[PDB]
Structures are given as structure tokens and as C-alpha cells.
Symmetry: C2
Subunit: 414 residues, 2 copies
């Protein structure tokens, strides 16, 4: 009853629908996806602006000594005739009659009225931004579907847009279920108790996705309270519910029965390593009516994060309006021998480093293994930035064979 991972997210990509757009402020638009076309209301520059510090001249007059008629520093709104020059700084408006601008280190100084000598001859239009040189009027400078970075903020500011129409981020509710879970603030542990590490992990994992987290806390293994928390969640306005634990084969695992009771489950077992259990349900809020997506993530720590990175991250990007929600996939060569599982494809976590020499004798990517891949050993996720997509061959891949990998974190490194 296991669904392949390719079909698994094919279902999610078919059920998840992009969120309605919202108006936000300029800084609130950082990282979000543009939901409208931006047109510049005036050109840039809206006036002939000097590119270099120096003097606005007539190209015909050529080199020689000339008087400085007026001055036109960046700030103010007189013409120049053949035989006179005007002093300008960068950004300054060019007066009428000027054909070009000579630099200042291409001029000489030369106590009443001042005169300046021009050492070179300039072709017409030298060091001058014509009106609309960089941005023309009413032109599209940012288009729908673009992700707002720092430069796109600078373009919005150039055009005067401080209120932007964007697709918002999904609100995410997160909870843990386990009768053995205690808060991480707990000091000495009692018999059969462990601290709750999946919740704080998912909270931070969603925080990195710039989504609003709503911390529903620890829930015990009982149907009544687990239902109360679920009914609280969907009615609070959340878009995605993230459940950790209570989705296995035990007789107190009420996540699958409660999801299929309140909505429509699409799968509960996935051909994965790790993370054989993975429940994905569609729930409907009953108020403004809206559809809520629910991920019953497995309770094992490394299994929880892995399912988050492969099935929740694209779901978040798709609700936020990304055109390419899928993660970056790269081909790399192995740095050490590693065996694969024969039954299900193993998402082996590795540390990816770019090298100016590998894959053969060319520059490419390499990846060393993090160690043991136990579903409970969270030390395998430590400093892991890649996810090796290993086939279910059961063989041993040599320290040089090429495989496929998913980028789950920014490499940076050296």
C-alpha cells in the first residue's frame, strides 16, 4: 500500500492550490512572490543626468580654455552656448546646449570669475544618461511571478511602489503527539520520558520558510484531545497542519483515523527511506470557507525533518505562488563507499562541498556521508545540506560513482 515518492508529491502538487494575493508594505514584501505587474510612472533618469563629476561641454568646441557659466550640482532644476561650459557633479541635471560631459581629472583648475581648461575632446553624448536611459516610462520593471529580492525592492522603491500586491506565506500549525514527550525545558527526565525535539525542529524549519508558526504544543495519545487540537487548528485560520508522531502501527496512533474522519486522506504509507509512514489529508474548514492541508509527519526525528524538506517545503512554495517549487537537484560524485537499501530508495543525507576538481578531473560537486542513517539518530541530520537519492539496488556504490542529490540547505562552505 506504499505509494512511490514521485506519485506522492504528484498528489500534493495536485491538491495544493496557490493562496489568494494580499497587499503588503515594501519591507513586508521581501522574499514574497509578486502578484502584479509593476510599471514605472516616470522614467529614470527623468532628466538628463551627468554620469561623471566634471563639466558639461559642447562636443564641437573641443579642447582649450573656457569659462564656467553656471553650476549644476545634483539638486537644482540658464543654457550653455558654444564657447562656455557648466560645472556638474554626478546626478546633476545637464543644462540646455550641452552635448557631452568631460571628467574632472581630464580638466585643469585655472580669483574673480573662474575659468577651466578642457584637456580632451569628447564625442557627442559622452558620459550622459538620456531621459529614460536605464528605465523608460510606463515600462514593466517587475512582472508577475517574480520573487522579491533586495534588488527588486530597489526597483519597487525607484518606481514609488511602497504597497505591493503579493502572494502571502502559508500559516503553519505544528504539534507533537506522544505520551513519552515532555517539554525541552525539563531538567532530569523521569522513567520513560524524552524531550520533545520534533516540535522545536519543525518550528525553526518553518521559520526558515518565512511562514507564520502557531505552536499547538504536545498532545497525548488519546482521540479526544487530539481531535480538540485538530478542530482548534483548522478553525483558527491555518493553511497547513504539521503533525509529528502518532501515525504508525501502534494501537494509540489516532492521527490517521482522525484525519480520514475529518477530511480525505490521499496516502498513509510511502516507499521511502526513512519515513515509511507519511499521511497527507485534505481538510475543509466550515465557517469564509477554505481548504486546509494536513501532513501527518512520522515521529522519528530524522524521519520528520526529511519528510518536511521533501513534501512540506514544495507545498509551502506552491501556496506562496512559486513557479518552480521543487528543490534544486544536482548531480555529484561520491566521496566514500556507501551501500543502499534493496527494498525502498534511501534518502541518504550528506555534506555537499563544491570542489574545483572532481567528478573526474573537472570541477563539480562531492558529498561525504554523515554516518549512521538510523531513523532516530538526529546526529545524521547535523550539518547535512544534501539528500542523496539512492536507488533500491542494494549494491555498494564506489567512492567515485555519480548519483542524484537534493539541496536542502545553502552550501556556502569554503
Amino acid at each position: 500500500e506504499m505509494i512511490p515518492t514521485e506519485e506522492a508529491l504528484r498528489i500534493v502538487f495536485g491538491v495544493s492550490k496557490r493562496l489568494p494575493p494580499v497587499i503588503v508594505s515594501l519591507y513586508e514584501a521581501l522574499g514574497k512572490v509578486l502578484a502584479e505587474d509593476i510599471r514605472a510612472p516616470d522614467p529614470l533618469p527623468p532628466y538628463p543626468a551627468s554620469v561623471k563629476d566634471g563639466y558639461a561641454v559642447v562636443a564641437s568646441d573641443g579642447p582649450g580654455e573656457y569659462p564656467v557659466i553656471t553650476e549644476s550640482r545634483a539638486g537644482n532644476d540658464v543654457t550653455v552656448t558654444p564657447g562656455t561650459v557648466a560645472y556638474v557633479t554626478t546626478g546633476g541635471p545637464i543644462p540646455d546646449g550641452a552635448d557631452a560631459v568631460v571628467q574632472v581629472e581630464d580638466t585643469k583648475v585655472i580669483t574673480e570669475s573662474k575659468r577651466v581648461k578642457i584637456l580632451i575632446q569628447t564625442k557627442k553624448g559622452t558620459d550622459i544618461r538620456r531621459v529614460g536611459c536605464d528605465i523608460e516610462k510606463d515600462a514593466t520593471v517587475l512582472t508577475t511571478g517574480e520573487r522579491i529580492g533586495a534588488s527588486e525592492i530597489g526597483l519597487l522603491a525607484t518606481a514609488g511602489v511602497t504597497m505591493v500586491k503579493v502572494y502571502p506565506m502559508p500559516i503553519v500549525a505544528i504539534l507533537s503527539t506522544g505520551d513519552e514527550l515532555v517539554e525541552p525545558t525539563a531538567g532530569t527526565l523521569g522513567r520513560g520520558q524524552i524531550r520533545d525535539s520534533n516540535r522545536a525542529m519543525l518550528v525553526a524549519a518553518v521559520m526558515q520558510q518565512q511562514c507564520k508558526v502557531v505552536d499547538l504544543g504536545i498532545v497525548r495519545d488519546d482521540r479526544k484531545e487530539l481531535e480538540k487540537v485538530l478542530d482548534e487548528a483548522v478553525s483558527s485560520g491555518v493553511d497547513i497542519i504539521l503533525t509529528s508522531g502518532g501515525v504508525s502501527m501502534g494501537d494509540r496512533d489516532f492521527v490517521k483515523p482522525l484525519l480520514e474522519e475529518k477530511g480525505k486522506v490521499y496516502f498513509s504509507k510511502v516507499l521511502m527511506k526513512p519515513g515509511k509512514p507519511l499521511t497527507f489529508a485534505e481538510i475543509r474548514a466550515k465557517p469564509l470557507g477554505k481548504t486546509v492541508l494536513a501532513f501527518g509527519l512520522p515521529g522519528n526525528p530524522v524521519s520528520c525533518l526529511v519528510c518536511f524538506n521533501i513534501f512540506v517545503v514544495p507545498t509551502i512554495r506552491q501556496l506562496a505562488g512559486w513557479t518552480s517549487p521543487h528543490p534544486l537537484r544536482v548531480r555529484l560524485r561520491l566521496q566514500e563507499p556507501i551501500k543502499s537499501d534493496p527494498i525502498r530508495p534511501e534518502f541518504h543525507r550528506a555534506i555537499i562541498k563544491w570542489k574545483d576538481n572532481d567528478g573526474s578531473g573537472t570541477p563539480g560537486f562531492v558529498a561525504e556521508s554523515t554516518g549512521h542513517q538510523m531513523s532516530s539518530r538526529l546526529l545524521s541530520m547535523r550539518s547535512a545540506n544534501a539528500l542523496l537519492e539512492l536507488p533500491a539496488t542494494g549494491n555498494v556504490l564506489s567512492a567515485g560513482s555519480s548519483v542524484s542529490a537534493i539541496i536542502v540547505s545553502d552550501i556556502s562552505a569554503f
Copy 2:
């Protein structure tokens, strides 16, 4: 008087010193660098825990029918003898006398007291996490110098650390100087006015670096107010001052004279394209005494962001305690013909996409040019995630030659 870029940041890397560590909360520790060693106070698991849902058995008894003595679900703290089995779920404590755990789909059901039939024979220690299986007691699970991601949050929660010793982020003050600058909220522009796009750009650029921004606003081209803003900045507790504009050859550019007056300037002209002007000064606060770093970024929009990505981002990472503050550098092949400047090396911005086939017939990176590289055309920074490091050869590199590139944004893409 131009300093090469390699020597330029060699100075910055020599002047910038890592910040003193601060205690923060668990969620406040996301993204920051660990300034202490974390040791687990108890092992994980602190008790023998069942890996699979099923029954704890004696390996010697083998297959057959057996009674279910007690039940041990995840939660509670009776022994089992050869001939009896105990029902356990995942996470449950294993009673005394059990050697292994059989799965539940490897058992049969079989109305008074219940009996269960074991279909298979298990080797000793099957599906059982011994005490400390994943994390041993007093072991280092996170070490100094590590960047706290989502999984490192999960490890901190496992160990009970909710107050962490980390290196903080630098506080960054940002300001613009220009007598032609108006706020981006301005509607119809007057004669000689442009909206201030560098400030909002730098604010967002620093926001992406998870640093605290202090918006000092627009400052006119005059020495008195520009000094008042600088004296306000260093006295407010800031660690880095980011200035935009007023650092060129004009006669109202007071950033260089005021920086060298209040501190020690290390360079003012850099062999760069774009961004020939780039002033870096060291200022000292006069109170707890502290040293402030000042970047006089050039006023041209694309020139401002480029200097930010190459000289400010590593300075931020070094103050925050990174061991590899330098950006990721990758070798890629060109997708189109492009000419280089003969005098200074040009940092040409490109759109980098990973392809399963290029550089030859192998998988690698490719990069297409963004278009015109004018220092004032901010449309060249649009959707640019890479920075081509072009040599000062002045030749034309064919649509297939390999060059060096700096990753300034997460590729993602397809």
C-alpha cells in the same frame, strides 16, 4: 591609487573582529553561530526503547503462540520470562527479560486473557535501541563554530538547552546622501529629483542577513548634517555603518573627508567594475568602548548592491563568527558571448542555472548575461544570482568558455 579587490577585502578581513558572545533563547538562536560546546545531560534513549510496533520477546523462545503478560506503550516506566511476551509500541520501554522485538505484521491476533502468535524467529537485539543508542551521555552533540539550523535546534531541544551561547548579528546603520534624493513615497517628481532606491535596497539586503537595521534616512550634501548623522550612528551602539553616495569626485561629497577625520580610512578607490569608489574606514566609539566599521558605498544603484555583496556580507559573517565568511565560488561555462573591460576586472551579473549537461557533455553550471552592465541600470541586478569574475583581458569570451562566479543568491530555479 586603486587597491585590488583581493587586497581590499584582505584589509577588511584584517580589521574586522568577531563580536562578543551573547546568551539567547532557543528560537532566537536560529541562524546564529554556536559559541559554546553542547553536551547531552542524559543519553538518548535514556531507556531501552522499542523501534517497531509489536511485541517484546525472548530471542530463544522462537516462533509459536505466547501469552501477553503486560503491556508497555510509550509512556509508563513486571518482567518477561522465557515463554511470555509483552506488547509494546514504538518508543515504549522494554521490560526486563526481553531480548528482541518482533514487528506487528509479523504476528497474529489469536475473549478473556489474550494470546498472540509469533510467526518469525528474531536474533537478539532486533528492533531495540539500547540506552544511548543514538546519543551517548555527556557526549558533544554540537560544537563551537557550528551554524544553528533546524536540525541543530532539534538537537538543542533533545539536550534540554533552551538558552544558548551564540555570536550575535551585527547592528547595521544605513543612510543615503544626495541633494536629489526624495522618499520613495513621493508621487510626481519635481525637477532634478529621483526616489531613494539604495536605502530600501540595503535595508532589505541587510534584513536577508538577519541583522538589525537602523534607518538613518536621507542626508543632504552638507558636512554639518552628514557629521551629525555619523556622530548619532556610532554613539547609538551600531557595529557597521552603511553609507550610500557622496563618495565620488564631486565638490559636495563629504563622506571621505568625514570618515578620515573621525577614524582611519584604509582605502577609497578600488580596481573594480562597477564601483571604483569604495571607502572603508575604522571609527572608534568614545563612551563601553567599541570599534565601528564604516563602508562608504558608491551611490550608483547596481554599484551599491555589488559592493554590499562582496565586501559587506563577509564582514557581517565574520562579526557573527563564521569560519568561512567568503561566498561560495563556482566554475561555470558561458551561455552567450560577452566582452570584458581592459582596465579593471568586471563583476558581470548573470543568471546561473544548473544543467544536467554543459561545460562539455557533463552536468554543470551555466550562466546567461542580464544585459547592459551600466552602473546606474538597476535592471541588471534583477533576478541576478551570480557574479561573473571577469579578468581585465578586454577580449571576447566565447559561448562556452569557463569562468569564475560568485553566488550572491540561492539558485533554486528548476
